Structure formats: structure tokens, C-alpha cells
Design an enzyme around this catalytic site. Structure first.
Site, PDB file in Angstrom:
ATOM      1  CB  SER A  10      32.887  37.082  36.506  1.00 41.39           C
ATOM      2  OG  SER A  10      34.131  37.464  37.058  1.00 41.39           O
ATOM      3  CG  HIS A 216      32.192  39.248  40.668  1.00 40.93           C
ATOM      4  ND1 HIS A 216      32.816  38.317  41.468  1.00 40.93           N
ATOM      5  CD2 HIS A 216      32.732  39.111  39.435  1.00 40.93           C
ATOM      6  CE1 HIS A 216      33.666  37.615  40.737  1.00 40.93           C
ATOM      7  NE2 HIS A 216      33.633  38.080  39.502  1.00 40.93           N
TER       8      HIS A 216
END
Length: 234
Positions: A10, A216
Site C-alpha cells: 500500500s 500511510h
């Protein structure tokens, strides 16, 4: 440019950076991810973007190496975090408190130090074989936290430091594996320093919503944290 394959999890697909390609499905490949930004800024890039949210090294082997072949000029990858159970670890840490967090991190760090190197070799061997002329850039993960200051977050200083250590571990393991296959390693702490969580200028999502975005890179993190590191290796 030319044939660029962007592999990984990711951090490469760009979960958290938004503007996702609808066809990538659950892979969540962002047009603001560093590979998409790279392709969009290097004229003529034949851009094969197979990175995928949730990917482990095994997923890279099963689903992602398809466009990697003798024609490939550039390969990028972030992989190994999910193998070590980083997402799961972060979730546990923010739900069950420090003791459980530290234990979960320790388990993750044991994985990173012991179990992960051979799984990286699995992937890197595949890249070695399929794309022998490709310039290969392995990018690391950022340390998630700036230590030493007051920070408005649920994780204790100990937990932050422990998570940082996990990052340090995975980056050390990965830089040496990458170099062991003659791949470049891109240390993204070079750019994320001053932009960790608790830095006052985060380029990472904290524990946030939508849930998948937590820890993230933000759009800014992809464009100025990750992408400049890929560009530095060209």
C-alpha cells in the site's frame, strides 16, 4: 522513459494519497502514489502498476510480477511490511494499549529480523531472473514518529519508539537484501525526517478515517517523501 513496473504494497499503491484508479479494485492504486507520479512526469513511460494494498511478498509472487520481463527498464517496490504484520500491529497498538502494543511490535520485529529476509529474496530472485536489465529500486518505509516532543496521539512514547525501531529493522534488513541483489535502496527517512507523526508537519496519516489510510503517506508524503527518493535513483 519506458517500461516501468511498480510492485509492492500500500505504500507503493498509495493508500492514503487518494485519487485511486477505479480499475485497480481493492489494490487502491493512487494516481498520486509515487509510481503514478513518476510515470506521469517521465514522458513515454509504459507504466505497469501492479502494487496492491495488503500485498505480502507472496502476493507479489502470485499477482504482481506478470508484467516484469526482459523488456522492463525500471522496477520499484515496497514490500515486507504486511509480511511482518504492520497493519495488524498498528491496529492492535491503537486498541489494546501499550503492553499489548509492545508485544505485537516485538513479534513483528522478530519477523522482520528473522523471517522476512528470505521472503524478500524470493521476490528479488524473481526480479533478477525476469528483468535482468531493469534498474531496480527498493524503497523503504518511513519511521512513523518523531520522538522527544509532546504529541497529541494515543500511542505512548514507548510504543512510538518501538514502531520506529520496527521501521529501522525493516529498512536495515531491506537495504542489505536489496544491495545483495544489486538493487538500489531508497531510504525514505531522508525525506520524511521532519514529517513523521508528531513532527508538526506529518506526511503520514495518523490513526484516521477511512481506516485503511492510517499510517500511510499523505498525498504530500507520496509526492515529496516517496517520489523524490525514486527520482534520486532516477
Amino acid at each position: 522513459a519506458t517500461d516501468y513496473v511498480a510492485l509492492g504494497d500500500s505504500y507503493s499503491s498509495g493508500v492514503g494519497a487518494g485519487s485511486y484508479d477505479s480499475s485497480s479494485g481493492s489494490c487502491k492504486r493512487s494516481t498520486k502514489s509515487y509510481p503514478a507520479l513518476w510515470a506521469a512526469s517521465h514522458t513515454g513511460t509504459r507504466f505497469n502498476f501492479t502494487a496492491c494494498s495488503g500485498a505480502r511478498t507472496g502476493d507479489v509472487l502470485a499477482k504482481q510480477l506478470t508484467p516484469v520481463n526482459s523488456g522492463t527498464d525500471l522496477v520499484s517496490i515496497t514490500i515486507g511490511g504486511n509480511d511482518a504484520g504492520f497493519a495488524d500491529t498498528m491496529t492492535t497498538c491503537n486498541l489494546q494499549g501499550e503492553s499489548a502494543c509492545l508485544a505485537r511490535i516485538a513479534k513483528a520485529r522478530a519477523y522482520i529480523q528473522q523471517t522476512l529476509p528470505a521472503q524478500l529474496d524470493q521476490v528479488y530472485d524473481a526480479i533478477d531472473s525476469r528483468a535482468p536489465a531493469a534498474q531496480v529500486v527498493v524503497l523503504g518505509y518511513p519511521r512513523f514518529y518523531k520522538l522527544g516532543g509532546s504529541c497529541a496521539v494515543g500511542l505512548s512514547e514507548k510504543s512510538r519508539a518501538a514502531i520506529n525501531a520496527a521501521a529501522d529493522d525493516i529498512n536495515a534488513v531491506t537495504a542489505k537484501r536489496a544491495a545483495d541483489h544489486g538493487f538500489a535502496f531508497g531510504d525514505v527517512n531522508t525525506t520524511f525526517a521532519g514529517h513523521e507523526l508528531c513532527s508538526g508537519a506529518p506526511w503520514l496519516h495518523s490513526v484516521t478515517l477511512p481506516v485503511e489510510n492510517s499510517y500511510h503517506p499523505t498525498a504530500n508524503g507520496q509526492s515529496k517523501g516517496y517520489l523524490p527518493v525514486l527520482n534520486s535513483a532516477t
